Amino acid sequence: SVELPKRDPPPGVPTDEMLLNVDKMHDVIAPAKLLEYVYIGPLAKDKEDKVKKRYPEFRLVNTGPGGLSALLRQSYAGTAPNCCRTFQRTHYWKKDGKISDKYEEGAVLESCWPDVHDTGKCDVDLFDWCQGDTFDRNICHQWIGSAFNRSNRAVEGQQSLINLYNKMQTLCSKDASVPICESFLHHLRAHNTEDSKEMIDYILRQQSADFKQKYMRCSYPTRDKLEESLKYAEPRECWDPECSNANVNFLLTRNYNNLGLCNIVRG
Amino acid sequence: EVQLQASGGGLVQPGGSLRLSCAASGIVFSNNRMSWYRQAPGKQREVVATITSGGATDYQDSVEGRFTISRDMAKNTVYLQMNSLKPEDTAVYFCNARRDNFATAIYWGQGTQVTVSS
Amino acid sequence: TLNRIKIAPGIADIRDKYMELGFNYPEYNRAVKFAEESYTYYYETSPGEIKPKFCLIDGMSIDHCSSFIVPEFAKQYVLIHGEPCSSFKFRPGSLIYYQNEVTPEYIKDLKHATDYIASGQRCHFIKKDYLLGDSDSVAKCCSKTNTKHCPKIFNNNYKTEHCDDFMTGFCRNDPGNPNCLEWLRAKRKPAMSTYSDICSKHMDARYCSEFIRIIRPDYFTFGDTALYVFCNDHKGNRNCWCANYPKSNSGDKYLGPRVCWLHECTDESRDRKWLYYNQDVQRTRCKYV
Questions:
Q1: Are A17 and C79 in contact (CB under 8 A)?
Q2: C-alpha distance from A242 to closest chain B C-alpha (Å)
Q3: What family does the database annotate (chain C)?
């Protein structure tokens, strides 16, 4: 033949993308959002299945030559039981029937919707969970607290809010002593609008005979009390020991208002 | 002379409504507790609703939610709204005025009849 | 079968050259134009792009494309697929230009009868952001102890949510950390929930004052829950005595409207945080004579 002028290529100098290793990347990949491309480095064909198993909520895409690849989130598969009963975990790892917050090899990532509480997608789980002895004071108050002003008033989230209010109306009419309904009434009072006031009064006014005498003596005085109250020009609530004692979450709106009307001297 | 004539009663089947009025003269609401009273024959009178000189209200338990008392300052007239009336609301209704911190300056007005029957 | 291999220098671009060929059989007399990258790029060929004048032969290691980029400027860029190109096997990585006489037909034909021509894709880099791929890189960006090679998603003063997982554990440890308060100021539920747990234990810290100052009015429950647990765990503590009064069965003596009854719970020098939200609403409404 003839003597070809041979040239060797300049030394390969990798980049961060080329040096990436998906095995080290669970903390990078779990917080990724919808439509966000998480680049993960070269991936061998015999690993693609492993990586798709580990991250079933993500699509595995081939971005460039030599197996260069990325994960694109497609969905959130977290379950109400694992997402709704906590405001702090955003995902969990499932292995061998067990659920763990921390990553272990062999585990499958499941991810909670980032706005799950803000959407009302937890309302059917927590309406149940919060009732009974499964009640977690901190979680269930937070759940009820946060239902007000949902999705910054997006229409889906505003309906969520309404529907839940009706469901809680029907429940707490039956027995407002049950700690979810006490918190519900407590939080209606904080909202302090026409609709929350008439929801409180509607609920309190449907309580049973025994409830009213155990809890609402301030709102339903004995005739002996009422006719004593006429003598003084102060409203009854300002002196009546039944109202200084009483539990404010069970006062009617009128009575709760009136308690504010009692002039104290500064000091 | 202090006048507390009540007016507005009558006949209604149960569930209807009635609005009593008391056009007080000789007394001012700015320093009087005004109250609506009942008296069914055979029984002693009873408070039904009351309003302080500042405007705080209060009710007898059996009428709470159904009745609501209000007042018009410029008209010096107190009202009783009676909704969802029960056969046991049958009584003569009248108004009562009490001077804020005097006790002896108490007055009673003329009754009005409301009866509720099928 | 070949003869008279020769390198013609280019007219302008030192990288461009001409490979003259000798021939057997038909007049294959051609002067095929080709380039071979020399520059190392610290800038872009075109918007968001950097395309080295280099053909990546099938089977060649990807880093050969990356060798013509300064390693710092490279961190941002990803290597994607590229346009079909042809190369001299014996001189692999040469970019052949299809000009005039040089034509895809020619190149297809040459490979079939000879093995001195191979084909692949041109090096095509495109700009994205820093490629984070490790737990520590996350901790550094999110905590802001080192920020330099961080993408925006992990360096936007907690506007997005990517750092929330890491910050739950971080701020539990250093609650007073100024970045933890910037995190809490974005008012997303894992931050607020985290500080509800923290302040349920250390309500008396000043960072819990700031916690309450933020979550009120809109997310007040996260403070109320913490006040309840803290004053439950410290019955008898003086700052607790408006919220969990310790001489009564239930601690409600000065709840709601009644908060206004004691001058102490009204006191404007005392910390809102030591009153429930419903309470401190009513405080701003006492009818003093």
A1: yes
A2: 14
A3: Belongs to the orthopoxvirus OPG143 family.
d(CA C271, CA C260): 15
For chain A, state the CA radius of gyration. Answer: 30
Q: How many CA atoms lie within 13 A of B111 on its CB side?
A: 13
Contact between B75 and B3 under an 8 Å Cβ cutoff? The reply is no
Closest residue of chain A to B34, computed from CA coordinates: A230
DSSP for residue C24: S
Entry field: residues in chain C: 289
Measured at the alpha carbon of residue A169, what is the angle toward residues A164 and A173, in degrees to the nearest 5?
Answer: 155
Write the DSSP assignment of A111-169 as a string of letters: E--TTHHHHTTTHHHHHHHTSTT---HHHHHHHHHHHSSGGGS-HHHHHHHHHHHHHHH
Q: Which amino acid is at A30?
A: A
List the domain boundaries for chain A: 16-113, 118-207, 215-222+230-259
Domains contained in chain B, CATH given: 6-100 (2.60.40.10)
- Element at A27 (helix H, strand E): helix A26-29
User: Is the separation of the CB atoms in C255 and C279 below 8 Å?
Assistant: yes
- Nearest beta carbon to residue A230 from set B54, B56, B98: B98
Q: Compute the distance between CA of residue C194 and CA of residue C175 in angstroms, rounded to an integer.
A: 10
Using what technique was this structure determined?
X-ray
The residue extents of the domains of chain C are 6-127, 135-283
Could you tell me which chains touch chain B, where touching means 3 or more CB pairs under 8 A? Answer: A
| Minimum distance, in Å, between the CA of residue C62 and any CA atom of chain A | 6
Structure tokens that stand for A233 in this block:
């020009």
Q: Are A94 and A87 in contact (CB under 8 A)?
A: no
> Which residues of A make CB contacts under 8 Å with B?
205, 212, 219-221, 223, 226-227, 229-231, 233-237, 254, 258, 261
- Specify the resolution in Å: 2.5
Output the six-digit token pair for C173: 């440890």
Tokens of C77: 């860029």
Helix pair A179-191, A194-204: axis angle to 10 deg: 150
